[PDB]
Amino acid sequence: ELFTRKLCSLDNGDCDQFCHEEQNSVVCSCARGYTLADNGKACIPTGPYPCGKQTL
């Protein structure tokens, strides 16, 4: 018997990066160097060379 995928288990809870469930809802956070967007899902780089991006 396999659980139905919901919350953070469903497409990373629609977060760009870190997803945790708190108070029974999805909460998104970002690595250092990013700030959470107004939609509270996307992470925006705050400077020129943010971590984990290829320099293309």
């Binding site: 990066q17 945790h20 060379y49 320099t55």
Partner: protein, 233 residues
């Protein structure tokens, strides 16, 4: 790296290379920040005094965005064990800050729980370095990268003559002749998630290179996330 592809311009910006007194590459590292490299503990035993090269893609030419940094502090994990390579991890603090540019940038550190459920459950990660292209060959002069499948711990342990501890994981191919190799030690295992690359492992050891029924063994970075953060304070 045995197999895999050459690292193209800007594709592995977080690669670092440890160089000896003779300016030779002997181990890999990962860029964590302006001041900090991640590598393998056992790499420290390989050279008397060493330095850190970044932005390097071709040992024979001058990359241009290439730079050498000196080590101020070496923080070896106090539990590292020569007999098992458990806790094979160290952090380097540089004397001067790294300049981020084309081919020089840090990898992201994930959070532990999210890393375990999301990153570590992807099909594959990428490993890279300037190590041998064959088990008995010379160091590479070109940076290479190789997509390596995650291996389940069962298959991993069964295939292993030695103890795979909780601080390690397996990645690679049962038969396909691609793997990390001597000289890739200390280098990046990163996992892509939604166009962002996170540090997941440190090149540790293997029984040979790309041998049939064997795998590459990596330090599980998720197990040291807290420590790594302590280190940078």
């Amino acid at each position: 790296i045995v197999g895999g592809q050459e690292c193209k311009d800007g594709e592995c910006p977080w690669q670092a290379l440890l160089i000896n007194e003779e300016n030779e590459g002997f181990c890999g590292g990962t860029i964590l920040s302006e001041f900090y490299i991640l590598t393998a503990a056992h790499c420290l035993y390989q050279a008397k005094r060493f330095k850190v090269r970044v932005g390097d893609r071709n040992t024979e030419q001058e990359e241009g965005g290439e730079a050498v940094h000196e080590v101020e502090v070496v923080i070896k994990h106090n539990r590292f064990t020569k007999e098992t390579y458990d806790f094979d991890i160290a952090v380097l603090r540089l004397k001067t800050p790294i300049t981020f540019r084309m081919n020089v940038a840090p990898a992201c550190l994930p959070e532990r729980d999210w890393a375990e459920s999301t990153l570590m459950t992807q099909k594959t990660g990428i490993v890279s370095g300037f190590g041998r292209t064959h088990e008995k060959g010379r160091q590479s002069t070109r940076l290479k990268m190789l997509e390596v499948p995650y291996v389940d711990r069962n298959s991993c342990k069964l295939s292993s003559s030695f103890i795979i501890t909780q601080n390690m994981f397996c990645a690679g191919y049962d038969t396909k002749q691609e793997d990390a190799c001597q000289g890739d030690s200390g280098g990046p295992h990163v996992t892509r998630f939604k166009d962002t690359y996170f540090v997941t492992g440190i090149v540790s050891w293997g029984e040979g290179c790309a041998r049939k029924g064997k795998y590459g063994i990596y330090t599980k970075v998720t197990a040291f996330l807290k420590w790594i953060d302590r280190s940078m304070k």
